[PDB]
């Protein structure tokens, strides 16, 4: 039976910033001194003959070792305790996901649980929905270590569009009778797009006339999600507003175009799509042309016989003019024909043809007119 000093409790787990009572007791017949050694501030104090009690408050530091001591028979009696603070996982943070992520690519989940301790008792979990992607236990870390970090690389799936990812931190104090403390990050939603290497198909005529209405179509396939893809069509400058319809992962853009005197000649039909951050484009060179209709004119529509009539077919400054089988003489300017009205010329038709070359293409516009020979006696 040696005389001893005792400090209670020996091991203590207090939440950071918290407080606890420490009791020092001794069996020595009379103490010549007594007290408790700590850096911590105290609030309440209690005492007895063989014992002494302090309430230690506002304990921030991960590790502090108090020593309760007594002096009995000119000998120093000692007891050494241990006080360990713990912090709940108040901050659990998942790193921002890529705004758009490629399907078949990899992205990295990063969870961060600052300050939570002790680290050794921490278990971090990365989740996709209710499923656990990875589970990490920190057992074996230093006793004074606070905070934890878990990172994993996940493969993006078409399955994964609109899926929620979260991080889950778990502090296990159960051996100390303090149970479990857990908190989760706000879920992060994942966007997965898939864009095939192919440029969009653009269906257009190579030749377009000013004022004419022709169908134009742009299309693509293998687009996920097809709904989020934004397709732009236009002829040169002017923007077409096609009807974009979605069949499976394929889109179909259908529109109509009229040349405004923008162009004529060399122009581009552009179709560009954006899905995610990626963009595709297809350009078609298109020729526009102005082909003014040939003007067929009679000196008079109605004439008596013997009266002189001049029929002419005039065109724009461009084409080759053919009147009644006779090419314009000379070429490039209106062709004229003259005749004296006969009774046989009543209900007689005249014809003018304009032949224009555009990009090697031969284009014709035919026109007709009818002459009336007024009836009378001779
Ligand atoms: C529709 O019309 C447009 C023009 O309105 C037209 O675009 C042209 O495309 C050709 C190629 O198809 C371009 O030619 C290039 O010209 C550059 C100089 O600017 C050259 O250096 C390029 O040469 C490359 O390839 C060579 C081997 O073939 C290499 O030797 C060289 O190092 C380069 O790698 C290239 O030939 C031309 O510039 C444009 N025109 C304009 C005005 O931008 C387009 O082709 C038409 N579409 C169709 C289907 O015909
Ligand atoms: C701390 O000191 C000792 C720890 O054992 C306590 O001393 C005894 O406390 C019990 C409580 O039921 C009493 O029955 C005994 O008579 C006490 N013994 C003596 C010699 O005092 C003491 O009570 C504790 N003090 C506090 C505030 O917890
Ligand atoms: C669980 O963790 C979340 C995420 O860290 C905590 O929510 C945050 O709370 C603090 C302020 O108290 C701020 O960072 C934000 O207001 C929250 N961040 C968000 C919403 O992303 C939350 O406090 C924790 N829950 C607990 C304590 O159990
Ligand atoms: C899709 O086509 C449009 C046509 O307007 C492009 O818009 C312009 O493109 C020119 C030529 O490259 C650029 O110099 C301009 O900055 C663009 N202007 C405007 C107002 O958009 C557009 O760039 C194309 N889309 C993509 C992704 O390139
Ligand atoms: C200790 O005393 C302070 C005032 O100095 C008081 O505000 C606080 O409540 C006390 N701490 C406790 C009871 O843990
Ligand atoms: C997934 O991520 C791992 C880790 O970087 C990498 O080794 C692997 O190539 C990725 N899978 C792909 C790119 O399909
Ligand atoms: C993802 O989480 C949000 C809440 O943040 C929820 O509204 C949504 O339904 C979830 N998405 C799926 C597909 O579970
Ligand atoms: C028609 O009659 C007029 C007047 O006599 C004459 O000048 C002309 O040569 C005749 N022939 C034609 C085709 O005009
Ligand atoms: C000439 O005009 C007629 C009727 O206006 C039209 O039906 C025909 O297609 C034209 N001829 C040619 C060769 O296009």
Looking at the CA of 104, name the nearest ligand.
Answer: 6
Written as one string, the DSSP assignment of 168-224 is EEEEE-GGGT--EEEEEPPPEEE-EEEE-SPPPEEE--SEEEBT--EEEEEEE-SEE
Integer Cα distance of 291 and 318 in angstroms: 8
Q: How many CB atoms lie within 10 A of CB 179?
A: 9
**Gap between the Cα atoms of 110 and 112, Å rounded:** 7
Report the C-alpha gap between 126 and 123 in whole angstroms: 10
Q: Which residues contact 96 (CB under 8 A, 6 or more apart)?
A: 188
Instruction: List the determination method.
Output: X-ray
Provide φ and ψ at 46, rounded to 5°.
Answer: -130, 155
SS3 at position 99: coil
Q: For ligand 5, atom 9, name the residue with the nearest CA.
A: 43
What is the per-residue DSSP string for 331-360?
TTS-EEEEEE--GGGTTEEEEEEEEEEETT
The 3-state DSSP class for residue 60 equals coil
Structural element, H or E, at residue 61: none
Q: Is the CB of 92 under 6 A from ligand 3?
A: yes
The residues lining ligand 1, judged by C-beta closer than 6 Å to any ligand atom, are: 266, 285
Question: In angstroms, rounded to a whole number, what is the distance separating the alpha carbons of residues 141 and 102?
Answer: 37
User: What's the CA gap between 200 and 368, in Å, rounded?
Assistant: 45
Ligand nearest to the CA of 310: 8
Inter-residue contact 252 to 217 (CB < 8 Å): yes
Burial string for 163-178 (b: 16+ CB within 10 Å, else e) reads: bebbbbbbbbbeeeee
- Choose among 359, 365, 315, 366: nearest CA to 207: 359
Helices then strands (H, E): number in the chain? 0, 38
- Measured CA to CA in angstroms, residue 310 lies from 131, 298, 324, 371 at distances of 92, 6, 13, 11
The ligand that comes nearest to the alpha carbon of residue 366 is 9
Domain positions in the chain are 1-88, 89-197, 198-290, 291-378
Domain 198-290 matches domain 291-378 at the CATH topology level? yes
Domain 198-290 has CATH 2.170.120.12: no
> What residues contact residue 288 under an 8 Å CB cut-off, 6+ apart?
207, 208, 209, 210, 259, 262, 263, 264, 265, 267
* Residue located nearest, by CA, to atom 1 of ligand 8: 340
Q: Hey, how many other C-beta atoms are within 10 angstroms of the C-beta on 330?
A: 7
Q: What is the resolution of this structure in A?
A: 2.5
344 φ, ψ (degrees, to nearest 5): -75, -10
Strand order in the sheet with 82-86: 11-15, 82-86, 63-64
Torsion of CA 206, 209, 214, 220, to 10 degrees: 30
160 in the Ramachandran plot: left (φ > 0), alpha (ψ -120 to 50) or beta?
Answer: alpha
Whether 155 is in the pocket of ligand 9, judged by its Cβ within 6 Å, is no
Q: How far is CA 331 from the centre of its chain?
A: 61
Instruction: Name the one residue in this structure whose structure tokens are 């005792």.
Output: 6
- Report the CATH superfamily, name and number, of domain 89-197: Immunoglobulins (2.60.40.10)
* Sheet strands side by side (includes 361-374): 302-304, 361-374, 348-358, 320-323, 326-327
- The rounded distance, in Å, linking the Cα atoms of 195 and 100 is 12
Among the listed residues 167, 168, 172, 66, the one whose alpha carbon sits nearest the alpha carbon of residue 117:
172
Residue 89 backbone dihedrals phi, psi, to 5 degrees: -70, 70
Which of 103, 107, 227 has the alpha carbon at shortest distance from 160?
A: 103
Answer whether 311's CB lies under 8 Å from 300's CB: no
What angle (nearest 5°) sits at the alpha carbon of residue 333, between those of residues 315 and 359?
60
Cross-strand pairs, 36 = 68
Class of the domain covering 1-88: mainly beta
User: How do strand 75-80 and strand 101-102 relate by DSSP bridges?
Assistant: unpaired
Q: Which two tokens stand for residue 237?
A: 């400058």
Indicate the fold that domain 291-378 takes in CATH: Immunoglobulin-like (2.60.40)
Mutating to test ligand 4, I would choose from 232, 234, 238, 279 the residue with most ligand atoms within 8 A of its C-beta, which is 232
């Amino acid at each position: 039976e040696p005389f001893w000093a005792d400090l209670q409790p020996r091991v203590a787990f207090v939440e950071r910033g918290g407080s606890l009572w420490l009791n020092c007791s001794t069996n020595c017949p009379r103490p010549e001194r007594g007290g408790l050694e700590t850096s911590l501030r105290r609030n309440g104090t209690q005492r007895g003959l063989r014992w002494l009690a302090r309430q230690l408050v506002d304990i921030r530091e991960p590790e502090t070792q108090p020593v309760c001591f007594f002096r009995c028979a000119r000998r120093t009696l000692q007891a050494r305790g241990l006080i360990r603070t713990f912090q709940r996982p108040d901050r659990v943070e998942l790193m921002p996901l890529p705004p758009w992520q490629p399907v078949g690519e990899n992205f990295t989940l990063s969870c961060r649980v600052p300050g939570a301790g002790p680290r050794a008792s921490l278990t971090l979990t990365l989740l996709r929905g209710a499923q656990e992607l990875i589970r990490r236990s920190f057992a074996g870390e230093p006793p004074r270590a606070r905070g934890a970090v878990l990172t994993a690389t996940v493969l993006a799936r078409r399955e994964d569009h609109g899926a929620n990812f979260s991080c889950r931190a778990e502090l296990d104090l159960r051996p100390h009778g303090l149970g479990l403390f857990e908190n989760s990050s706000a879920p992060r939603e994942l966007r997965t797009f898939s864009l095939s290497p192919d440029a969009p198909r653009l269906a257009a005529p190579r030749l377009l006339e000013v004022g004419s209405e022709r169908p134009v179509s742009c299309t693509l396939d293998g687009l996920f999600p097809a709904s989020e893809a934004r397709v732009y069509l236009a002829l040169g400058d002017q923007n077409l507003s096609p009807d974009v319809t979605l069949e499976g992962d394929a889109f179909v853009a259908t529109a109509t175009a009229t040349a405004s005197a923008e162009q004529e000649g060399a122009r581009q039909l552009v179709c560009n799509v954006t899905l995610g951050g990626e963009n595709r484009e297809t350009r078609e060179n298109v020729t526009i042309y102005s082909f003014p209709a040939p003007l067929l004119t009679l000196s008079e529509p109605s004439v008596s016989e013997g009266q002189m009539v001049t029929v002419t077919c005039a065109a724009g400054a461009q084409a080759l003019v053919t009147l009644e089988g006779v090419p314009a003489a000379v070429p490039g300017q209106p062709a004229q024909l003259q005749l004296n009205a006969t009774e046989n010329d009543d209900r007689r038709s005249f014809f003018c043809d304009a032949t224009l070359d555009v990009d090697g293409e031969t284009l014709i516009k035919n026109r007709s007119a009818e002459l009336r020979v007024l009836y009378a006696p001779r």
